[PDB]
């Protein structure tokens, strides 16, 4: 009896992800994503379960990890609003509910050094940099597949981007209480985090509210071998699962 736990395959719909250097997948709070049951349901409308047309891996535009990269943050389901049929359903329905399989990818040689913290934060309410009672504007909290680069400059009505304070006034070291995985280049090239639907309500508006936030944060900085390109690509691939939509309706218009 031999085989491996580092070699993994995830097939969702027509999409397949393979990894040969995987660290054991994280299932947030030991709870797999599931469809809403009738005993928790409030909305009487029969939910559209879109199956394999949306429950598939959407790869997000790659990020560049440099020696001076502070990190990146994505909001879900926001990040997938422009992704195929999922995005359309998201905008055509009043209510939406979805779990996610997040798959973060960062490959390097055995000469490379560095560690990413891949963490999923439910209700990642961002802090404004202006302090006081200043609000973070819709456009900045809903960036899409672009996400928020924490290495960037502040913007008027935008969030605070000091990765040390998790953009919320909590310390970085404590993010490990949230379902997380490291991409330690010596050990691992892929993180995977299966997220269930986490909310105080059984189903919610997908446009106005982001249930979870994916953060990829360099802890140990990238140290490339001598003469190497001082950069590594980080590719985020997200698949909705157990997705439910309710209250189909004219397409919602959002800011921008």
């Amino acid at each position: 009896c031999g085989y491996s736990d580092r070699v993994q395959q995830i097939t969702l719909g027509n999409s397949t992800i393979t990894t040969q250097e995987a660290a054991n997948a994280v299932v947030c709070y030991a709870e797999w994503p599931e469809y809403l049951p009738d005993v928790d349901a409030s909305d009487v409308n029969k939910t559209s379960k879109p199956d394999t047309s949306v429950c598939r891996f959407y790869t997000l535009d790659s990020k560049t990890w440099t020696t001076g990269s502070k990190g990146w943050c994505w909001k879900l389901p926001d990040a997938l609003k422009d992704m195929g049929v999922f995005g359309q359903n998201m905008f055509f329905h009043s209510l939406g509910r979805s779990g996610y399989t997040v798959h973060v990818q960062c490959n390097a040689t055995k000469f490379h050094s560095g560690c990413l913290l891949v963490v999923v934060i439910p209700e990642h309410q961002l802090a404004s940099h202006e302090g006081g009672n200043v609000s973070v504007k819709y456009t900045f909290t809903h960036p899409g597949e672009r996400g928020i680069d924490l290495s960037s400059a502040n913007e008027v009505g935008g969030p605070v981007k000091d990765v040390i304070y998790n953009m919320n006034g909590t310390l970085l070291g404590n993010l490990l209480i949230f379902p997380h995985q490291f991409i330690n280049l010596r050990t691992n090239n892929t993180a995977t985090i299966v997220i269930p639907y986490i909310n105080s309500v059984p189903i919610d508006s997908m446009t106005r509210h982001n249930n979870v936030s994916l953060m990829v944060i360099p802890i140990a900085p990238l140290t490339v071998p001598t003469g190497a390109t001082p950069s590594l690509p980080i590719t985020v691939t997200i698949a909705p699962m157990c997705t439910e939509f309710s209250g189909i309706r004219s397409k919602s218009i959002v800011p921008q």
Binding site: S4, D5, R6, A23, N24, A25, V26, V27, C28, Y29, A30, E31, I177, P179, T187, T192, V194
Partner: protein, 40 residues
Amino acid sequence: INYYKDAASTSSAGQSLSMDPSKFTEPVKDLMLKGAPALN
């Protein structure tokens, strides 16, 4: 003995003796045993 009609009127429930730290400590898909190689 409860002196009121409402459940909100009652005293605190004391302790939930049911703990399970696993949901926070070991939220992994595949089972990881202490002693076994974490990855193989």
